[PDB]
Amino acid sequence: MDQVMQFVEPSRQFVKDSIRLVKRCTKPDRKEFQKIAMATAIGFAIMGFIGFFVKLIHIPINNIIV
Amino acid sequence: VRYSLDPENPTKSCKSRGSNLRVHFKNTRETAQAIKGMHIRKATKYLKDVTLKKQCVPFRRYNGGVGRCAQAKQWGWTQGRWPKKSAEFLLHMLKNAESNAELKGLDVDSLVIEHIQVNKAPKMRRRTYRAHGRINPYMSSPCHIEMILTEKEQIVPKPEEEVAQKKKISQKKLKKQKLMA
Amino acid sequence: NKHQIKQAVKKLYDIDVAKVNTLIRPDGEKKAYVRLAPDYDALDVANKIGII
Amino acid sequence: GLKVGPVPVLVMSLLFIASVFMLHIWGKYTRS
Amino acid sequence: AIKFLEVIKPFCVILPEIQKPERKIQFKEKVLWTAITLFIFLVCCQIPLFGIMSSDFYWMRVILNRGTLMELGISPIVTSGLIMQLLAGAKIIEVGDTPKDRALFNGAQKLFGMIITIGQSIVYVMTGMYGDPSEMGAGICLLITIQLFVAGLIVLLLDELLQKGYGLGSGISLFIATNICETIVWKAFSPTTVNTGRGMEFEGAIIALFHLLATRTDKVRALREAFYRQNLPNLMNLIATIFVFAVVIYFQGFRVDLPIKSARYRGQYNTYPIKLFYTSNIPIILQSALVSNLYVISQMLSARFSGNLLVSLLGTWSDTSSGGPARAYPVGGLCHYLSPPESFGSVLEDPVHAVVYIVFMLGSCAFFSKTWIEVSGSSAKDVAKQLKEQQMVMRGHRETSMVHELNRYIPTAAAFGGLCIGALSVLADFLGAIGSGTGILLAVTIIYQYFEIFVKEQSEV
Amino acid sequence: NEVVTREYTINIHKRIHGVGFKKRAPRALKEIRKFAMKEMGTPDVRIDTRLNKAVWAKGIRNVPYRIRVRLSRKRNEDEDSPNKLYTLVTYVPVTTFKNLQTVNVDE
Amino acid sequence: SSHKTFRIKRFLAKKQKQNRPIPQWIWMKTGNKIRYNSKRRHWRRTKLGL
Amino acid sequence: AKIKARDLRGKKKEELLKQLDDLKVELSQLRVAKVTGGAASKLSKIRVVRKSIARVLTVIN
Amino acid sequence: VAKQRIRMANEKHSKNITQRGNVAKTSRNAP
């Protein structure tokens, strides 16, 4: 079946490549996964809060200006 | 680093030196004595003639077996030769010295070769094979060179055909810079 | 030997082997050219092993 | 090419930041 | 070539540049440069522009990046950056391969960013996004240009200083990450309040909980109101963002580690990483463009040719005036099939359409990722040339056989990498997580670099 | 008139007289290159490979006595090169050498 | 020769592996004195004798 | 989860043979990793797994 | 492949004498 396999085979093989690439991928391990998780949270808290305060502080100053 | 002599006015002098250079010591000592006291533009012009065999280096001390030529009469001497590697090596040292003068903001057109000294460097060992299963030394005779340039009141601007030349680009220098970058 | 290599390959990776060719390298190591049965894909098996 | 120092950025930007204030403060307190 | 470098040459010869740090700077000093840098930028955002008079709204100019000194954001400087490596990748511009020319090449990039800013600031003044010039006068228009323009130069100049070793990493990435972060934090703890007929209601999702968990007598009622608003953010939205954050973190570590070594020196083994998100957030941006302007064309086309089945089948359109701007809605046809579902109930009530859009979104993201690599010069051949230029090689391989080894993963990482990028965005939006994958991926990746930098210097810091 | 072309007959017989067999043809090329510099004053002299083939057409020792050449002084497109001009020496096949003068060629 | 005994082909293999330069991190070792592999051999300059 | 000889003293023979086999499978994977570009962590694990193999065989003998 | 191309390509190379310093890297410019 030309027109079937002419599009089925590539898509079917595309899954083959995708599965194969996932097996070869170095996946993060639970201890590595945990190390970053706590890292990102702290880093997230830093930047957001620093920005959160600055946005707050100019609120009254914005009121004075407008 | 210490030089054999000291500049009289260090604020008006530039230095250059090189060590373990693989150019014959004897040819180079003679070549340097020729340009001692020369103005840099004259000195640079002279060494290019030696390469083209239009001016000779008189061999005054190390003259054993050296042939005679009509250009040695310019020096009140019968024996002269045209050591090409000695001239080329000194043209590189002069070029380095001239750049040192620029780095110090000196008038390069007033520089004179005030001091220049050629020293024997440690000798490099090879061997030659002789009759009857004998081996003999085959020694290179490298030299150390050091030159001090000083400003004088005579000015020689650089040749027109020399200042108009392109700043040659070296592909191999570009490669290494890119790799470092 | 070849029989040992063939049996080790099958047990370790649960594949079938057609034949084994062997040479001893100039550095002293022994290299084994293991060919798999036609119903096996060495390219797929390599991904299982981690080679590719 | 023109070169610049790091602090000159901070100083020049700060003066600009100060200059922005004058726009809001003077532009209003003269017209309020 | 000649009329490209020679044109640029004189302009950069005059343009400014920051000096290097001669000897390596200490880490705690780097932080202090970074700390000052982020503070300055934040101030510029909170500052509303001076002179915006007619239309875009004083309240909006008080509250909101809209209307600030950062109206254009970093898009102008970013736009040049993508434009630059696009043309270099596209072969449109001959690469001036020398370090100083390459610095000059970067100089042209800075010029383009400044050019775009004036071009964008001038355009927005013409379009009237701050009012008509005949009303504001040119002098007010000129002030608008200067404020936006100078900000770009300062923002442009600040980022480089951090890049040049005075600080940490890149200021643009720091700012973009922080804005994403402040956006989620703001929605999490904003004390601002909105007057529902029932009274003022806090924007801060976490604030609203206790504010509503204390006020309402029936805590069963507050168990829903704060978490399932539609005109206000919900703690469920914060909940998904947390879940999406964990997912993105897990998939950040995916990569194929290829062993490479220096061709000149023994040992010294290093790894070349092929990140799963090979093409970054570019594929979705390209995916957004085709979605956005396909609607624009299909809307205009049907208006003048509504009688054609060639256009009606392509899409039936409607102008949905739901308060804000009239939101274009694909009534039916292809465009509706190429549009997202808006609610959970809609998704399950029309499963077939959900499948189609989900599938299309993935297919689009994968394709744009695959095609992007060839355009961007990140394919196997390009990567091999980078390694060859850097004197790196695979152990046991020839220079020509490196390309084959990279082709095992690069084309597949592109398609599978793009597909995952789109897929993650769909789930994030289906969960209404704040900022979707694009923001979360950037923020998660960016904090990792600074995290990694800190760890190295944590050795003694 | 930097870009000029003339046609010459080079009496190779008197140029290589007395030269050893294994050096006869090589010295014809050296004398052709020396001749071109004299007539045009350009150290950058380029000898066409067809003229090289004509000088060697009879071997290393039995070199042709006379040879009709053409010299064209052209501008060196290589700005890097220290020589603005250069001479190109091409070959002119002739049936006879009798009464052949030095002739200006107009292009 | 091509005709080789296992014992000879194994002796030659060990002589092949010892013919390499020292690792460059050996230089930074605390009490290091070695500057280079002084036991390098060349197939042409000096012969294995077996 | 490191292997210490004290933990292994009272176990049955077949239980230690199973534990041995898991380590041997682990080492073989690491040796594949050693040539496919495994991280420095996997390379450092080789010596840890090798001495764990020795510990089990020691307690069995 | 025609053997006459050896001659035609050989003669073309000889013409590089007049274009020293600017010789074409590839005469099959397309592609």
Ligand SMILES: [Mg+2]
């Ligand atoms: Mg004598």
Ligand SMILES: [Mg+2]
């Ligand atoms: Mg004698």
Ligand SMILES: [Mg+2]
């Ligand atoms: Mg003998």
Ligand SMILES: [Mg+2]
């Ligand atoms: Mg021998």
